[PDB]
Every structure is written in C-alpha cells, then in structure tokens.
Amino acid sequence: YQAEAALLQCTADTLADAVLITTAHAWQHQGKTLFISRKTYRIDGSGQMAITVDVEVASDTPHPARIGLNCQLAQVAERVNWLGLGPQENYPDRLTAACFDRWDLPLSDMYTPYVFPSENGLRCGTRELNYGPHQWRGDFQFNISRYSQQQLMETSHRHLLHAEEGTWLNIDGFHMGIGGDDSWSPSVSAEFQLSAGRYHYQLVWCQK
Amino acid sequence: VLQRRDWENPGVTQLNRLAAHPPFASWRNSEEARTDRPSQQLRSLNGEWRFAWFPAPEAVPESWLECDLPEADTVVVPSNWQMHGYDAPIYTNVTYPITVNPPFVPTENPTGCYSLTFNVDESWLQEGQTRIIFDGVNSAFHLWCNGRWVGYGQDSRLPSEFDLSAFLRAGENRLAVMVLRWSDGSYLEDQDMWRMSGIFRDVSLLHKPTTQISDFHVATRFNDDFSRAVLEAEVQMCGELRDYLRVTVSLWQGETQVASGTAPFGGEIIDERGGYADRVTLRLNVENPKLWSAEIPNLYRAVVELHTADGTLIEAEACDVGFREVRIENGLLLLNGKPLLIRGVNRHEHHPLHGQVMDEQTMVQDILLMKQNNFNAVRCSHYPNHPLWYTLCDRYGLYVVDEANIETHGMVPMNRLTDDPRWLPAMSERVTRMVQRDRNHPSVIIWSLGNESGHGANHDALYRWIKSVDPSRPVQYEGGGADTTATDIICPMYARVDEDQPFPAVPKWSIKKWLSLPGETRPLILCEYAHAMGNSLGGFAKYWQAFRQYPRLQGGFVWDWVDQSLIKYDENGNPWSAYGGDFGDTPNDRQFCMNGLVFADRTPHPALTEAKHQQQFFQFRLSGQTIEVTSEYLFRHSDNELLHWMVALDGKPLASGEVPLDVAPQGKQLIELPELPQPESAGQLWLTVRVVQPNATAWSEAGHISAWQQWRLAENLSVTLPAASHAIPHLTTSEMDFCIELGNKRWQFNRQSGFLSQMWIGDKKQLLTPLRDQFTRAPLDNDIGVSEATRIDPNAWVERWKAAGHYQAEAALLQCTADTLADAVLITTAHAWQHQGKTLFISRKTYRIDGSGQMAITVDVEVASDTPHPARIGLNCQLAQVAERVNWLGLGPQENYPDRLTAACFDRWDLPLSDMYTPYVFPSENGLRCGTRELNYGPHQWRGDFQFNISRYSQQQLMETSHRHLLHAEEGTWLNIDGFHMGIGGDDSWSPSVSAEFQLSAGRYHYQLVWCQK
C-alpha cells in the first residue's frame, strides 16, 4: 500500500509512421524491490495508442491482489458499453454464471453497494470497453466508478461515500480470486493467486 | 501317444506327474541343512543336450526314442529355441498368436526334441526313490527314459516331477523330451510378452529315501504387541510308518539355536474316522522374535529332521522363516500391525540375449536397482517366477505378489473360458500348485488369481479355495471390474486420480471416488498404473500426492520394470534393439513390448529418477529457517542417514553444512539452519537438502543419496540498467534483405520469408537453417496410442494434429519492417500459418539489436480456439557448429517435461552433447530441459525463461525413423527453444491422457529471449 515508484528509464523515438515511448519503474519499500514494470507506448497515424506492459514480481513478496493500470478520467458519462462477461459483477473464481456478449448499463449499475465498502464491480474476460468518446481494446478485466480504491479502503459504511470529480477507471491484466470457503482464514485457492513471477498484457486506447 | 493328442484336451493336464511341494534338497546331514550347503542328493542336468526341430509332432521319426538322430545339434539347456534361430519369436499383446478355436491348436505345431545321455551312480539304484524335476517347459511335453514312456505335463511356469526309479539302469541312461509350442494350455497363457518355447528353466535329479518328508508348512502367530510368537510346523511323511520314527523341528538365528521340538507321528482327531497317522504338528514358542519386513529383513532358519528314536538321521529339509503378520483390518492392509504404503513395480522375466531364461546375476542386479530407487514391492507379472527369486526377495527385503499362470485376454467375451465348468480343472491346477510350492516364503504377502480373464464362477471357487487352505495372506484379482467378490483389495488397472472413465459393465472410477462408493470398505492398491512406454510418467506426482493424503489408498505397482526388446545383428555384425514385427512375426503389436523404467540391458530411462523422488521415505517442509523432516519408515529408526544442505545464488554456492538425522519411525525432526548469508547481488537464492547414507548396506554403496528436495528463498530483482554503449548498429536495406552490422558481427533478415536467415561472427556463417517458429513435436508413444496406417484412431493427439494440418501448415508473410532508433535497430515481423484457408496460428515478433551486440527477441502468438491445442510454441534453427559441452542454468541434470519435473533441481549443469539426447528405441521428441534461464553452447548464449532441447537429429528425422539404430547425425546442431511445451501424459498409452492444466489452451502466448555472443 506504501510502495513508491522510482523511474529507471524514459526515452522517445520517431519511427517511420509512429512515435515510441519506452519507460521502466521500480516499486520499493525500505530498500526491497517489490515490482518492476517495463512499458512501451506506440502512437500511430490512425491516432491509436498501443500499450505493452511487462511486470516482474519478487518471489518472496506476498502475491499481489492485481496487476493493472488506473486513472481518473475528467468526464462523466451515463452509460458503459462492453464486450465481455456480464452483465453482473464477476471475478476470476466467480464467473461461471456470467456470459460473453455485448452489455450496456447505466454507470450506477457498475457499482455494487456493499454495506461495508470494498473492491467491487469488476468484469472479467473483456475484449472492448466504450465510455464517452474513449474505447479500450485487449483481453482484460476492468471496473469503472466514481469512488477511488483509496476512498473505498478508508470508509467503513456505504452511506459515508461521496462521488469524486470524474470517473475512476481500473484496467487489469490479472486479478486475484476473492475466496469465500470461510472469512476468518485465507481461502483463495493456489490456481487463483498471482504467483507466476512474470506477467505480460497489452491494451489499445483509441477515440471512437 | 500320437492317437490320444493330450495337448488338445483341457481335461488332461498331466499324466504320472508327482504332487507339488516346497523346494527340497534331501540333505543327509543336519549341519549341511542348517548352513544351506549344496546337497549331494540334488544333481543339476543343465549343460549340453542334443536338439532337433520339427514342423509338427507327426514328423518326429520313431528311431529318436531309441538313439540320437545324426542331424541333431548340441545346445545349452536351459534355453528358448527361438533364441537359437530355429523359428521366429512372436510379439502379440491381446490377439492370440493362433486361430481361436478352443481346445484345438494348429496342425503345424513346431516341436522341439531334446535328449541327454547321463551316468547314474550305483548307490542311487539300490535304495530309495530317484525323481527328475523340470522347473519350466513351454508349453507341453512328453518324456521317455531309455525308450519307455514316463509321463506328460502342461503349465509352463511351475515345476513338473516324475519318478524314474523303475526306468533307470546302472551305466549310461538316455532321456528324450518332446516339447510342443502350442497346447490347450496356450489358451490360458495369453500374457502380453514374447511368445517363445523350450526347456527354459533348470533340470535336476533328486534322490530321496523310501521313508521321506513329503511336505511341510510353517505358520507364525503373535500376541497383540508382537512380543511372543508361536511357530507351528506341520510335517507329512510317505513310506512305511514305524513306531520308532520321530520328527524334530529346530529354529536357528545365525549359529544360536532359539527353539526346538520333537514328536512321533500321529495328528489330533479331525473327524468321526480319526486323524492323520502320517502327519505331526510341532509348536515352538519364541520370545521377542525379530520381525521380518522390507525395511529390516530379519530371517531365521528352520531345520526339519526325520530320524529314529535312537537318534539315526534319515533325511533333513530346511527353509528360511520370517516372522510377520499380514491382515486386512477396518479397510487397511496391515503388516506387523502398521499400514503399508506399496512402492511397487510389475516385473517380467526377460533378458535381451537369452529371452525368458533367468540367471542369478540378472536377478540380483534387478533387486539392487529396485531398492536403490526406493521400490519396496514387486508383482510377478503374470505367472510364478523362478524359485530363486523368492529367496532373494526374503533376504534383501521386497514384498511379493505371487500370481497364478492364467490369462485369457484374447477371448470374446473375456470370461468365455473362466465361466465354463469344463475349464475349472485346468485353472485349479494353476492356482493350487502355485500355493503348495510358495506358501513358506515370508516375502510373499498377497496371492493373485491371474490377470485379465473377466469374472467367472471359476474365479470365485478358487478365491474361496485359497482362503481356506492359507488364511494368512489376502487374495487379489483385477478381472471383471477390479472390485468383484473374488478380491480382498480393490485393484484397478490405470484408474486415474481425478477423472472417471465410465465404460459399460466395467467402469474405471477415479481412485478417490472409488473408495467412497455406497457399501465399499476394502483398501485400494492399483495392480498397474503409470504406463511407462517411451517418454512417459507425466502426472506421476499426482498419484503420490493422493496416496499420502488418503489412508485407504495404499499405493500401487508401476507398469513396468524392464523393456522387452530383443537383440538382432546387422550386416557388419553390430547389435541393435528390436521389437514386435522385427522377426517377420505377423500380426504383431510393434513397440508395445517396451514399457520399462530401464532399458533391456538395465540402464535407466529418465523416468526412473521421477519414480525415485516421488517414492522417497523422507518428506520435508520449510518454515522460515526451520526444516521439518518426517520419516515414512514403519519399523526402522534412521541410523544410517546424514542431512546435507546447500544455499546457492543462481548456481554459485554460498553456504553448506551437514546434520545427522535422528527420527523415529513415522516421527518428525526439526532442523534449524544457521543465519543464512544476505548477498547484495541480484538473483534468486535456492536451498537444496539431500539425505545421504554414509555406510554401505547389502543393497547400496557408501554415499548413496536416498531423498532430496529444493525451495526458493529470498530474491533480489535487478534494478540496474545495461551499460550505455558508444557504438550504434548500422542498417543496410536492399530489395532482398535487411542487413545489420556492428563490429565484426552481421545479421541478415530475408524480406520474402521474414526470418533471420544468417548471422556472421567475422567471416564464419553461424546458421545452416533460418530461425523459424515451430508448433509441432516428433510424436511420443503416448501421442500415437494404438493409431496405425491401416486402422486410424481419430481420438489420438497425433491424428488430431495431422487432420488439422499442424505438420503441413505454411507460413505466409503479413509484415516485415525495419527502423533505426537512437542506439538500436528494430525489425518487426508478422506471419500467419494456414491450412486450406483456415488460419491456425499468428506470430508477431520484434528483434532489437543494440550497441552491446545483443539481440532481444519478443514473440506474441495467437492460436485459433477450435484447432487442437499445439504441442509447443517456440523457435528452431540448425546451428553451423558442433561443440563438445552444453552448459545451462535451469532444471537438471536429466531430461524433464512440464508434467514430469519434480525430481529435477535448479542449478548450473554441464554435460557432453550426447547426454542431451535420450536414445529411446522408438525415436521421438526427447531431451527437453525446463525452467531454464541461461544456455551456453559454443560462442552463443541465450537468456530468458524457456525450455530447450539440443541435438544432432531434426524433429523431421525423429518422426520418419522407426528404430534408434537407423538415425544419422545431421550437419551442425538442431536447437529448439520453447516458450511453452505441452505435457507428455502416461496414465495409459492407448487413450489421450495429458491433463487439462498441461495443455496449451490459453489462446494467447508471449515469451522473450536474448541471443548474444559470450
């Protein structure tokens, strides 16, 4: 929760028909490196931005809850449209009931109002997501809402949450299971833990 | 004799054959019996005999009974006559090698005529009884002595004895033996093995006195905690009963007499008519007996003496006694009150030069290798063994399942003969004579009614016969669905751990589910599992996890110990390994005769090390700095055991140490490690522990490793940049090629194919073939199954890959571009693999060549969801150079695959190029190493996270060649580097058996390599 990103590399290059940005970051806590991410951004003449991500996780840190990107978008739209598992909230070890199709819901149905606030509203197996003028394409899991992960963690009751300016988007290449064999001891099975040490995913961000 | 045709009549299995009994030597001195010295009363007739071969028994001339044929050769006995070139051995699995028409056999019935001239001593003919013993003859035979007919025998795997007292004369005597290849007994001997014939075990003469010991049985009973035993010995005599006759039984431990008893003949009253006048039962008390087990094979020696009341010895007999108790209680098989875990293997009697002739030296070699690989049990598949085998298992310590010679696999339905009462006589001789021969051996713990003969009323009758004559051992039988009323143990073959196979009438449930079916209470021990054919034993760890977690899963017997290949010679007289069909035998079952963990010359396959590790007797757990050691021994303390530990950072040793093990049977020991070093340098730290035996044993050398395990400790990720180079690579663009130069190095990319087509260091070309994607492997035996060109099996992996076009698919270029960055050159390619308009795979690659001279390759592959999952996703090329050594940092040192890699350890390994090839007799994909981070070969170095194989043989040549002796080294070296590789399977080899977690089914894959010159 406390680890600070330190820049290792940030370079730019003009190719024939595109611009390529390359970055690398290390996340540290008291001298220990927890994660490294290496990214390329390729912006071509069609106006698409292709993002490639490669992450390494130290074998002796506890497996992380997710590996993804987040940002706060400036705009609020009424509807979310996606091609992926739906229509309800689904997670990697609770997604048999969800079906793959084109789904379309108001932004408020993308938030599950649990009385004790937590991570909520994820959709898995997603190939395309549309929100306002933006479109993301890939093979990912996402959640979209007016509440940051920080605000959900600090607030003990759903009536004390307030909508933030704009919309918080989380796009994950990988997400850990939620468990539930019991709630008083670790219960996420070994096949749902992010224990592989190296991960790779890719996204295209465009304006359609 | 030619008009009765006894070999075509299941009602006649013998004429004039003597009763079965335990092994006898007829000593005439009690000390010679006690110390097991050779007996003058037992002569071997093994050596040179005369032999003639005939196409049928009607072709044997009548003069052969009186005198030697001039056209006979001299041959060694024991032998199989197919091993001397007289006719071809036949390898068939299920189909009978003759027309199925019981009880008739072909009129063309190859016949072997053996003869021997021999002297008999004068002293042998004045007094007593002379008998001849044939330990095994295949398949039926008639015997003559000095021209006169003596008798007839069938059942190839148990001894046949005949009285020769009335036929022998002083001086020169002649035996004549006529052996038939086929008989009605052949219908009950359809085991999966080479079909051979001849006098293939020992021949001997035994002299007994007229008043003699004719049988004896030994039984042991215990109190609740095994602190007091009663040895009960029943002795029977033949000949004239006299009042002065006495029997003494004594029990020896080494040179110390421990117990003794003496009685006159006359048993207790049995029924309204009295008792046995010609039997006696002695009871001997033994306090604190040393118990026999496979861990500690403590033996006593029992001597039985027939003597007169005034003390004159008539004859002595002896055997080894082991005190142990085997019972089933509350659904568990117990030995000496503790539950067994069977580390078993199936073993055939097979030698590559001598066929089915077993010698002592071969038997001892098999037993030492078994114990050295953590096996404790052996199944006699599928017939009684040579009598010396049970003696060696008693002395060294292996549990034995002894099996009757009955298998009728090729019948339709499988129980056609075993449900018929006309075959009940023939089957009962095979079961009752085995029990009368072997019931005194401590190593025999379970009887088996035979193999693969369905379930018939004859099996129930014989199950109940054994329970009544020998209540001290359980009975098992697998036929008719493995859990019938004719078995004490559920004993399936090839049931899977988690997956059901619901066949009609005879389903194979998953073993965990079978245990809990409504009503079921018996223990479960697999009589055959993990078919080891070729490159196999994938998923072996999954059986051993289940065996340790479930009490009623008590282990199993691997199929099987040794490959049944034979030796043939080429034109230059060089030996090669041959299999079904290589002798002109037809029909045949080709390479299905090679299922062993060892090659026929007793050299190990790579799967042997996976078996050794899963079967270890010590289990380990790591918690912080503490190792917890658990013993899985039932009876011994760890008194010959030292734990070595070593910590290494990416192959480099940092700390080491030893600790003595002191752990009680089924106990635990905690070992605390010293404060481990904290290095600053990047990389993963690894801890390896190994259990070493400092002293030699009967079965192992000083320094033998019996158990090991490896864990990851702390990791430090590398956060330093590559050193900024001054030089920039130069790009030259022609119409045909992109060419990149830096210093003396040069790379060339072909613009029509889109592959790296050549690389130079100085002026020396490095490649003979372009670096290309590869999605296929030379198919393993488990990929092919029972599929053949005549009869295609559409469900096998090789058939799915062929029908879909994976072997034929052509790469089509979609894109090939080049760009100069600031400090590097970047090449981008894309290819599609097609077959008849369908796209199977797409690969997108980037090559980045920087100023340090490194080439970084990124690969992204898509696989169509409806094509069968590919065997691998990787690159291949043929390098121009041949080097002596391969050095790698990864799992090793032996061949390992994604579902067979628990036994391999991560370290720095270094081997000659030839150890990177596994010479399976049927060629296939082989030699892979997984989990690899760095590979060095000549001047080249590859870095990444990959699996590789390196050799002189292409995947194409391995797929097209049927025998390892026909392979030839290609120019240069074939390298395969895979991001991903499918599992090898091996639950069985005749249906798909690669588990879902080992299939490449994710649709999208990514991997990266760096290729440099260090």
Ligand SMILES: OC[C@H]1O[C@@H](SCCc2ccccc2)[C@H](O)[C@@H](O)[C@H]1O
């Ligand atoms: O080593 C082969 C194995 O074959 C299978 S039959 C099914 C496979 C098969 C059938 C016919 C020809 C070849 C293989 C047996 O059940 C095993 O005991 C073992 O003998």
Ligand SMILES: [Mg+2]
């Ligand atoms: Mg069979």
